[PDB]
Design a protein around this ligand. Structure first.
Ligand code: AMP
Ligand code: AMP
Ligand code: PLP
Ligand code: PLP
Lengths: 823, 823
């Protein structure tokens, strides 16, 4: 009977057993054959050849956690922007070299097959690109960690630039399956909605609820070469399917067609304000996921080690729930509904355990953006929960009162219930009330979380508030995407560095060396060529490989400032034009990002970018000195390509608007010099790299605050700054739009008359700051020289570090660089 | 690339290797582990170790067929009562033994695992077992045959008796997945619907349609020990899901949630009338299947052997289409459709092909059941197909007029358009006009086919009419469900009988060797014993293994006659009670059937046996001399159980009603005597066996037609017989009802006043025949020698015969029982 084991069925590295398991998977798993198989089959055969390995490990790893009994740290997040798992599972799992050999024999090119893979559409942006690094670093630093989210079938829309206009093409990545997940019908749990609270003798009962079924999908995550593979668990909604007659509800009328569908689309789609479905999604994921946690808590050796009712008395010791942005906050009242209505812990016992079990990483800098739901929305689909949210609140305000008697305005400033045109619930005030630690995500950002935005709460409980600066994984953002540059670097100092990133600091020691100079600039050369090429096979252009590579690949939005960036390109265009032969450096200026559907200004801004695009790039006198490029359907595996070929990172937001910034870091480590303003974490990048080593410019927060105070008038800059005057008049004449000259009319007025973000305010400095970079480009030695200084600096930006810190101050778990044994 | 082979994954009989592979599937496929695996997970581990051995073979067979390029025979049928695939994958592959040594060692009882598997809920009755049966033999006699039907998600209902009442529960057999099927998302086809035939220049176009997509699953089907595994490909309907934006349809209104849901349920469930669902199911599977059929055609080197059109002239030579019943009849206007509209064959050529290519099989005894669809549905949804059923009709009544110049009534009798209040297409007439073979399913059924229902069709084309007689398969129905009798038989005459069951005649030589006489009977007593255990362990009662186990397991219906069998179990009961003391040959009557949703009489007859039971079964005076049990939810996995264990075979239909009856044949092979009326398959069975070895009885057909001519006054029968007068007043005063006495009224009155099937006429001679049934039982030597004279004579009843008659006479290929190497 123990006879059934993991101990002999993967003979791992051998390029013989790898051909064996591939050919096995192609024929028997995939129930296909070489006379029929397409690239996509051979790719699936390869993904299972690498997947057999991963679950060897994963069964061992998990089983390990059941004996050792660690604190389980459950990351809740409604986005998980992973994006391709073949290559990453090969470099982390060691297997990279063997896979290339097996396919080489087999007559298949491995690289052909990895670009076959669809970006795991489970995330949309950085809140979920973050969560993803957090998942790989946690497992690398051997913590019994677990990511939890919803499965999205349709991800989040795909971008298509039709007519140089944005059409969101749909992304059902999943319509051929996913060789890395494993459905689990066996662990299908109810998520309840609507219903009615009866108050009954031993508390209450939440009766006549509608029910939707949550059904899980484990996908496993390897850690860099240490054999710990942990469990990402995504849920899917599947309706009750009694739908024909069961309950004698149907028959009468099949408006249950709508139960089936509405419920079924709690999994269908990631969002891109108020909606019963966003909130449906948010109750869904956290009900299900808490049902799981109570279950490994009750059984993981605790059906054994009960002493106290397999009690939650020891729940915060053993289990750790982390809230990523406000979207999971319903974990706080659900655990309080679960703990008191379902078991029976007295209210206080329950709360003690909630505040001890949770934490909340904040990603919002401006307070209008904190999630807040209508009480008539809460009281309709989550009735018991609104009761719980009202009682927590009450108790919080009694505690505020003991601590500040008579500051009556405090009581209403701090409440969970917000009065107004519509009485609301403020979800961040729920989390701070309900976690034992609140951390922001940037030096600067957690400061203002203390000083202005959460200050009353920071005054009532100063302990709670912490910092935990955002970082990249060195694996995906340094080795996968920048292989040779990982190489030349390891040469000089070891292999501990991809798992101990500030050792990059030893490269300091090479700043003047004309070897690591041509070295580093060689891998960058390689990189800019591979990327030179992709652009006219996937998509078509005419680069000049020599040129500056001005990259900005950010969510398209007003505060992010691709508008000033195009103003500079129009400036340059016209400068190359009026001075037809003037030696200036070249710059391939590429802006990439998806808009946000039915947001007119971001849809227009891309129209600007792909309007300049035709004009200047089909101007003769430009030739190859100026190039503008919109990167269509910019996503994680397009980051990995393009960040490698970056020279100049653009980081132009308005100061005070970014709460951190992760694409930022990614450019610094791949030897991409940042331009940018003093915001979010473009600041700590400066604290190590050195202010000189960084093109930090324009307004800081003070001057915007001071310009908001003295009234900002855009006309006044237009009338002084002379090439500005010129290019706005160009935009209105319909220079960049002969067929509808009128077309860009609203970008003009936006700027001219009503701009919140002060683009023109930082124009002036920007053209002269960008002139600093184009003296320096063409001082190639010193150019590279600052690029090395940059990389050695990168180290504090590894998720390794952030997890290690979340590990140490909040979670209460020590990191670990040990390799687990086995297969 | 040729290194991508089937060659090396073949440990086959190696128990060492089979255990290593159960293990790979539990840890790396199912991604589960011994700490957390359940019995189900162990079943699914085993379903996969074997599937390696199935699909390895299917790859070699399918390649084979394209290397050789055989005529391929397509069997479209809407029903495939597949019923449980593991032990039957194992015995046709010889792995039965090595799987139990490998699981013995791993500490898992194989029969346990075996009972975890759900029946393939792919069917409903006689017609779906016969399809699967033919299928198994199509494979053993080397036919390049495919099975094509509809994949029901939720089957047909599971039958559950509530207090005596049939409540239908549902059969979502697919609730945990199905290991044998691989879904083929890659091969999605559209089926068109509604739309509008727009006519132009060359020909017509069906424009503006609704499109549903048919998505296929493949399940390999293994022929006994010859290593040929063929294909059953079921289609699952799936709505296009651009419904969210595309078309611009939704946004305006998502009442399109209905398209999706009406589309989905072309597959959501089987039937149990003039439903557009029914008709959308029948058409679905036809449009879907003919696409793969012209696809394989145009591929299977018929690109190569084009010479003229990739000529559909040569199409019947490499294709065959079998319309098992009226249901795939749209296969004839649809093959025409593709051929004249899409290709551009002229009508006459195409008709030559659709006629040389289809072959109808009929299962009816009577005129009334023939499928007939109102023109207004064919015109609503299937507009182009209505126009071709009309030119086909139009041309046909010309051949008929030319050949019967002047008989007008024959033209209105052969018409494919039934006339009256509502205008129908008689879909059986279609099939005879497009097929080139029309065939019964028994000698007399085929006879009333050329003498009554289609005699004018028999007069216009005598050559098309055939007979082919149903058969069981000795692999499932003897080897698999009763290895015991199959062991005592295999020693005396050899294993060669399983592929050639007329070698069972040799058993006659041992009629008087008294070892076999007690061997045969040892097995039946062991069988009945095993099943008596089931009756106390999946549900319960108090059995007696020695009693005459009497069985009837047919659908519950008035003509199939279990109410006769009730009146006789209540005759017999009364007798144990007038004189308790007179020994009476004890019986355990078991009647089991699924009634039919919303058939009141059938719902009523079941509630009688679960009543007749409660009374006699509890009454002390009986002991265990007679008991009654209704078998809950008859289905192939129970038939494999109860048919082994039966003595009596209740084949009591009214004479003239039944056309063949596969059930009949299952009983004989498993050594059970038959009691029954001289209808359909009681005829040929009694003929190979001798009427002395059979318990034929009752109103012959002649007899019934006389009683009909004089008017069956049932009352007179009531008034001559006392033991009946007795049991009639019994029901009515409420003896078997008592809490609601009047409860059986509509049965008493049915019987007395409107019994279409003359249940009282066959009372007398039947209960007398049962008195001579119980005589023999009380003489086991001779009982078992009439059982030897029975088993030995089954031969004619293997489906390998029926299929051979079919390969050779209709499809036009010769069988092959040859071993194909593999793997
Ligand atoms: N009681 C247990 N003892 C050992 N390993 C276990 C146990 N329960 C679960 N596991 C392992 O942990 C994995 C995750 O378990 P679960 O927490 O049930 O999702 C399983 O796939 C097993 O590999
Ligand atoms: N042209 C071919 N040559 C060899 N094998 C083939 C060919 N076409 C199909 N097959 C095999 O037959 C199987 C079933 O083919 P199909 O008839 O397309 O369902 C495929 O999976 C292959 O294993
Ligand atoms: C890292 C990353 C980003 C980062 O955006 P920032 O605003 O720079 O933090 C965006 N998209 C993808 C796909 C990424 O991997
Ligand atoms: C063989 C079989 C039948 C056939 O029914 P008859 O009326 O006996 O021909 C019905 N149900 C099941 C489960 C069978 O296997």
């Amino acid at each position: 009977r123990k006879q059934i084991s993991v101990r002999g069925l993967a003979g791992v590295e051998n390029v013989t057993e790898l051909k064996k398991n591939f050919n096995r998977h192609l024929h028997f798993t995939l129930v296909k054959d070489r006379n029929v198989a397409t690239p996509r089959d051979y790719y699936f055969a390869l993904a299972h050849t690498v997947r057999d390995h991963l679950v060897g490990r994963w069964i061992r790893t998990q089983q390990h956690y059941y004996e050792k009994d660690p604190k389980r740290i459950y990351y809740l997040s409604l986005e998980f922007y992973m994006g391709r798992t073949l290559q990453n599972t090969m470099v982390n799992l060691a297997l990279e070299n063997a896979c290339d050999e097996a396919t080489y024999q087999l007559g298949l090119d491995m690289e052909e097959l990895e670009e076959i893979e669809e970006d795991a559409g489970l995330g949309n942006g950085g809140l979920g690109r973050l969560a993803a690094c957090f998942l790989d670093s946690m497992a690398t630093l051997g913590l019994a960690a677990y990511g939890y989210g919803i499965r999205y079938e349709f991800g989040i829309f795909n971008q298509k630039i039709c007519g140089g206009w944005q059409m969101e093409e749909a992304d059902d990545w999943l319509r051929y399956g996913n060789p890395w997940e494993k459905a689990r019908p066996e662990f299908t749990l109810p998520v309840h909605f609507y219903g009615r609270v009866e108050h009954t003798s031993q508390g209450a009962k939440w009766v006549d609820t509608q029910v939707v079924l949550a059904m899980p999908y484990d996908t496993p995550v390897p850690g860099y070469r240490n054999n710990v593979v942990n469990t990402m668990r995504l849920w899917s909604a599947k309706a009750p399917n009694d739908f024909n007659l069961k309950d004698f509800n149907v028959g009468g009328y099949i408006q249950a067609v709508l139960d089936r569908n509405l419920a079924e689309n709690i999994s269908r789609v990631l969002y891109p304000e108020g909606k019963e479905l966003r909130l449906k999604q948010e109750y869904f994921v956290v009900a299900a996921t808490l049902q799981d946690i109570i279950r490994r808590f009750k059984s993981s050796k605790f059906g054994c080690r009960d002493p106290v009712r397999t009690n939650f008395d020891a729940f915060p010791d053993k289990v750790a729930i982390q809230l990523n942005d406000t979207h999971p906050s319903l974990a706080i009242p659900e655990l309080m509904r679960v703990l008191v209505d379902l078991e029976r812990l007295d209210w206080d016992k329950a709360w003690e355990v909630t505040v001890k079990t949770c934490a909340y990483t904040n990603h919002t800098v401006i307070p209008e953006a904190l999630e807040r739901w209508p009480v008539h929305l809460l009281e309709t689909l989550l009735p018991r929960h609104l009761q719980i949210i009202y009682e927590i609140n009450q108790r919080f305000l009694n505690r505020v009162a003991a601590a500040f008697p008579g500051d009556v305005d405090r009581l209403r400033r701090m409440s969970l219930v917000e009065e107004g045109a519509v009485k609301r619930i403020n979800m961040a005030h729920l989390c701070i009330a309900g976690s034992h630690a609140v951390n922001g995500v940037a030096r600067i950002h957690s400061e203002i979380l203390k000083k202005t935005i959460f200050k009353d709460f920071y005054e009532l409980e100063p302990h709670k508030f912490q910092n935990k600066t955002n970082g990249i994984t060195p694996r995906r953002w340094l080795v996968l995407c920048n292989p040779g540059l990982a190489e030349i670097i390891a040469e000089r100092i070891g292999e501990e560095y991809i798992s101990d990133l500030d050792q990059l600091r030893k490269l300091l020691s090479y700043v003047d060396d004309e070897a690591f100079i041509r070295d580093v600039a060689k891998v960058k050369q390689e990189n800019k060529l591979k990327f030179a090429a992709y652009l006219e096979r996937e998509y078509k252009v005419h680069i000049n490989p020599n040129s500056l590579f001005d990259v900005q690949v950010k969510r398209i939005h007003e505060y992010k400032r691709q508008l000033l960036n195009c103003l500079h390109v129009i400036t340059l265009y016209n400068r190359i034009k009026k001075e037809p032969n003037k030696f200036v450096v070249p710059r391939t200026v590429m802006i990439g990002g998806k808009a946000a559907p039915g947001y007119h200004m971001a849809k227009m801004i891309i129209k600007l970018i792909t309007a300049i695009g035709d004009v200047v790039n089909h101007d003769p006198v430009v030739g190859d000195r100026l190039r503008v490029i919109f990167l269509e359907n910019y996503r994680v595996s397009l980051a990995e390509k393009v960040i490698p070929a970056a020279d100049l990172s653009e980081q132009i937001s308005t100061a005070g608007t970014e709460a951190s910034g992760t694409g930022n870091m990614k450019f610094m480590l791949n030897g991409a010099l940042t331009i940018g303003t003093m915001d979010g974490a473009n600041v700590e990048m400066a604290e190590e790299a050195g202010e000189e080593n960084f093109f930090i410019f324009g307004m800081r927060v003070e001057d915007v605050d001071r310009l908001d105070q003295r009234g900002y008038n855009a006309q006044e800059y237009y009338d002084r700054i002379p090439e500005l005057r010129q290019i706005i008049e160009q935009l209105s004449s319909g220079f960049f739009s002969p067929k509808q000259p009128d077309l860009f009319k609203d970008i003009v007025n936006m700027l001219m008359h009503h701009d919140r973000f002060k683009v023109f305010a930082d124009y002036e400095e920007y053209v002269k700051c960008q002139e600093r970079v184009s003296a320096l480009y063409k001082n190639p030695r010193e150019w590279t020289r600052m690029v090395i200084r940059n990389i050695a600096t990168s180290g504090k930006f590894s998720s390794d570090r952030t997890i290690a810190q979340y590990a140490r101050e909040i979670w209460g778990v020590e990191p670990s660089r040990q390799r687990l044994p086995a297969p």
